[PDB]
Q: What sequence folds into this?
RNA sequence: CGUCGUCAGCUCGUGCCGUGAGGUGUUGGGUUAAGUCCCGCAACGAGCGCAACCCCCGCCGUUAGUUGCCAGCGGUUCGGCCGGGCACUCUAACGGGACUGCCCGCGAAAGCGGGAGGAAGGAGGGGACGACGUCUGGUCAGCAUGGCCCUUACGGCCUG
């Protein structure tokens, strides 16, 4: 009945962090839902390469955010207290829901 | 011509972002702006030290600045006075209690920014450009470095007309992704204008 | 009892289940003659059935999603072919030559910068 | 093309009649990508033909197809900055292509208000041996073997 | 990008619809982006440097 | 049927005068054939492996037998000193003795030790070479 | 940054030929999208380029099942709405698969024409990727910048 929402730019570190979250939570007794991949959100920026003119240059950039979900069921006192303690990587952002 | 930036080409693979933090649309711009301020301050301050790279990280209203320097002795000094006052200055810039770290680069001949900086210094010291480039390329190649290349922009030795000098040695495959090419640019401000020194170092594969 | 095939065509996806019976086909809780009304090519979707002289035994339950009508038609065709191959594995010996087991892979080309639409270039005159 | 020889696209046979040439004609009628509308026009015309002409519409349609099949085209050759109309023998591929085309323009050139009626009338007339399409084909034919003098420029 | 103009757009211009946005790096007023606060040129430059986290060259 | 090297595909221009440049090719061949028999080839996707296989095939085809030369040879054996004129000239330039199975259409002067006989007629080649190889084997 | 131009070119090391500048390679035949390969040949290799390494789409596996999904069953206000499952579609990670690899003929070989098999067959479709250089090419009005000039106006506010 607790939801773990993970966001980040780099998917390697996000996947890694989700792995530790789910593993540690599993070791503390009750059932784990499992890492749920949610659809990524992509922003596109199209900018003229040239600084003055040549409007047909058009370099493309993308900024993509990834999403995860963990959804721990039957929260133990140990499960919760051991959680909200593990330090996040440099990128990964976490949200706790009921 | 018009080659693209060899780093921006390989950001996903074989290179890593200098800045590693996440922020929503709400606070992205503010964090980036303060990041730019930090980078500018550290560029201005730690020039003589032999700076190569600045890394920024964020966890929770926390900043972990990491500075790559050829000579950390210059950075720290006696009893870590300079590093302490520098931490104080950075924290005064942004109320987030930044945690400054200093790393020494192994064999500073294998850092493209450093090579470009040194050659730019030599140009500003009115050295002969061609000899300087040749010596720099040879120096890099002696320290492993399966390939090296150095370019100087133009306006050589106060001559009226500008011209590119250019010198390479070994393999510099700019087209292959798994190349691990280190890139460094330095601007040399001289009495007769400005010169642009570029350095590519092909350091292994994959 | 049930034989299942997927099939895909140009952003359209189908799911087809084949069952024994009198051969009544239904699509998205409707009739194949109701969902595809007035579309001439619609019958083509059922071609892989009558190839094996089916359409008299197999009732089809189809749930289809995405793309435009023709997209669902081709998706249904490929799905039916796959389901039939599952039902009678030797059908592959005869369904393959008539071009039923191939998944047509031609999709929309992305628009390119400096061009109107992906191939067409802006007109210029007085060269 | 300077290397390849542009493999002819193999059309899909029609569903109603089980014919490829029918599909070619349907495609030739089609404009602005509306296939369903074009097929409706063709089938409407076919039923009108069946109404006004006893036998099968497919037979009449095919008959018209060969009745508007030329065998002698004129090709422009640039010799000494002058255009030479060399007679040539149109390949069966080109024969069918030109037949279907000319049939379509001839049909659409008619004064009848509705498209299906125009298609039916053109097909019927071309089957008979008269109309715009057959006239155009005859004109093209007679254009050749009239500049036979100009046929030594092989091109 | 006169220093005066840059220093002027940083206040409350007596009205809401008088204020506008400028590139925080070069003071350009033309083609800035809300998400970044940079003009197109600075955006390209910083994106190439690798100083924008999770911003990469797109190819779909 | 000896420790002796051989060249029977094509005499590359500079096998002897440009010996080091060919030793580079020998090193490349040995390192390639070591890599192919290595548990490191799980990388380099299939097309790269195909390219490497093609390269190794070519190297094995051309420099087979030449691999046994750790250094310059102390002699040479030529079947036809006119067909293999380049080899003979290279051997002359470096002060290497020349042995040839010369025939009517050859210049005897360029050959130090000469066997005036046939260069066609497989039987003639067989007899001469078999005798020479047997003498090599026995006198070891 | 544009452009020739994603055109296929630009060179170097050693060897060899020439008194020498220089040549060879890099020419010739075939083939290719390509200086891409094969053969011939005093050349044998290499570097920057082509290609490949990267991304998207096309087929299939696993790992995962919420906010996405509903084949079977039980509810059902007819709504996947409920309980259920997560099989299927899908979402997003990691791999597999295609390499003329396998048969038939042909060629000295590169390769060519057919044939299974396969989702895809000979570059599978698209993108990113732009050599030495050319254009006194474009931009002192993105930014930086040497020189010259104004500094009660060529600076800076305000209304129209
Ligand atoms: Zn800017």
A:
């Amino acid at each position: 009945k607790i939801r773990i929402k993970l966001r980040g730019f780099d998917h390697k570190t996000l996947d890694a962090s989700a792995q530790k979250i789910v593993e540690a939570a599993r070791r503390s007794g009750a059932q784990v839902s499992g890492p749920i991949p949610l659809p990524t959100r992509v922003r596109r920026f199209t900018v003229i390469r040239g600084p003055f003119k040549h409007k047909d240059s058009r370099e493309h950039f993308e900024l993509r955010t990834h999403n995860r979900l963990v959804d721990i069921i039957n929260p133990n006192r140990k499960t919760i207290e051991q959680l909200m303690t593990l330090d996040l990587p440099t990128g990964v952002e976490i949200e706790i829901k009921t | 011509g018009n080659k693209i930036h060899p780093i921006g080409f390989r950001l996903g693979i074989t290179r890593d972002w200098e800045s590693r933090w996440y922020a929503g649309k709400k606070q992205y711009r503010h964090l980036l702006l303060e990041d730019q301020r930090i980078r500018g301050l550290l560029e201005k301050e730690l020039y003589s030290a032999g700076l190569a790279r600045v890394d920024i990280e964020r966890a929770a209203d926390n900043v972990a600045v990491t500075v790559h320097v050829a000579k950390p002795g210059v950075v720290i000094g006696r009893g870590g006075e300079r590093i302490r006052v520098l931490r104080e200055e950075l924290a005064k810039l942004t109320g987030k209690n930044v945690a400054l770290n200093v790393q020494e680069v192994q064999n500073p001949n294998l850092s493209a920014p450093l090579v470009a900086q040194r050659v730019a210094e030599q140009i500003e010291r009115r050295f002969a450009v061609r000899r300087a480039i040749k010596q720099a390329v040879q120096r890099v190649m002696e320290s492993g470095a399966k390939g090296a290349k150095v370019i100087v922009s133009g306006r050589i030795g106060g001559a009226e007309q500008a011209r590119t000098e250019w010198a390479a040695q070994g393999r510099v495959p700019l087209h292959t992704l798994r190349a691990n090419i280190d890139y460094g640019f330095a601007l040399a401000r001289t009495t007769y204008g400005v010169l642009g020194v570029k350095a590519y170092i092909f350091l292994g594969e994959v | 009892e049930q034989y299942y095939g997927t099939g895909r065509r140009k952003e359209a996806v189908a799911r087809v289940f084949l069952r024994p019976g009198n051969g009544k086909v239904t699509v998205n809780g409707q009739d194949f003659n109701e969902y595809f009304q007035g579309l001439v090519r619609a019958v083509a979707a059922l071609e892989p059935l009558r190839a094996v002289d089916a359409l008299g035994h197999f009732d089809a339950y189809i749930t289809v999603r995405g793309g435009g009508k023709s997209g669902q038609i081709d998706a249904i065709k490929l799905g039916i072919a796959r389901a039939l191959v599952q039902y009678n594995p030797d059908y592959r010996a005869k369904l393959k030559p008539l071009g039923f087991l191939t998944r047509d892979a031609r999709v929309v080309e992305r628009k390119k910068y400096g061009k109107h639409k992906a191939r067409r270039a802006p007109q210029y005159s007085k060269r | 093309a300077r290397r390849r020889r542009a493999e002819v696209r193999q059309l899909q046979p029609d569903l109603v009649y089980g014919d490829v040439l029918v599909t070619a004609f349907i495609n030739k009628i089609m404009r602005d990508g509306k296939k369903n509308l074009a097929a409706r026009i063709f089938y409407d015309a076919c039923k009108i033909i069946q109404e006004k002409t006893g036998q099968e519409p497919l037979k009449v349609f095919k008959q018209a197809v060969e009745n508007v099949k030329p065998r002698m085209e004129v090709r422009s050759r640039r010799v000494g900055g002058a255009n030479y109309q060399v007679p040539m023998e149109v390949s069966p591929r080109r024969q069918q292509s030109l037949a279907l085309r000319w049939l379509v323009q001839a049909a659409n050139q008619r004064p009848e208000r509705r498209a299906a009626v125009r298609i039916a009338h053109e097909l019927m007339d071309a089957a008979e041996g008269k109309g715009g399409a057959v006239k155009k084909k005859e004109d093209v034919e007679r254009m050749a073997e009239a500049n036979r003098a100009y046929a030594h420029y092989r091109w | 990008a006169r220093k005066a103009l840059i220093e002027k757009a940083k206040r409350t211009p007596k009205f809401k619809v008088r204020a506008y946005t400028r590139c925080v790096r070069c003071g350009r007023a033309r083609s800035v982006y809300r998400f970044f606060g940079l003009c197109r040129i600075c955006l390209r430059e910083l994106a190439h440097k690798g100083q924008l986290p999770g911003v990469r060259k797109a190819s779909w | 049927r000896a420790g002796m090297p051989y060249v029977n595909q094509r005499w590359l221009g500079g096998m002897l005068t440009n010996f080091k440049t060919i030793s580079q090719r020998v090193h490349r061949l040995e390192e390639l054939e070591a890599l192919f028999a290595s548990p490191e080839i799980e990388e380099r996707p299939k097309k790269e492996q195909v390219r490497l296989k093609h390269e190794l095939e070519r190297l094995q085809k051309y420099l087979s037998g030449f691999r046994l030369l750790k250094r310059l040879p102390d002699a040479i054996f030529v079947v036809d000193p006119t067909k293999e004129a380049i080899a003979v000239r290279e051997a002359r330039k470096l002060f290497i003795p020349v042995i040839a199975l010369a025939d009517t259409d050859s210049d005897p002067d360029l050959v130090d030790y000469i066997i005036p006989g046939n260069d066609d007629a497989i039987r003639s080649i067989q007899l001469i070479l078999s005798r020479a190889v047997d003498l090599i084997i026995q006198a070891r």
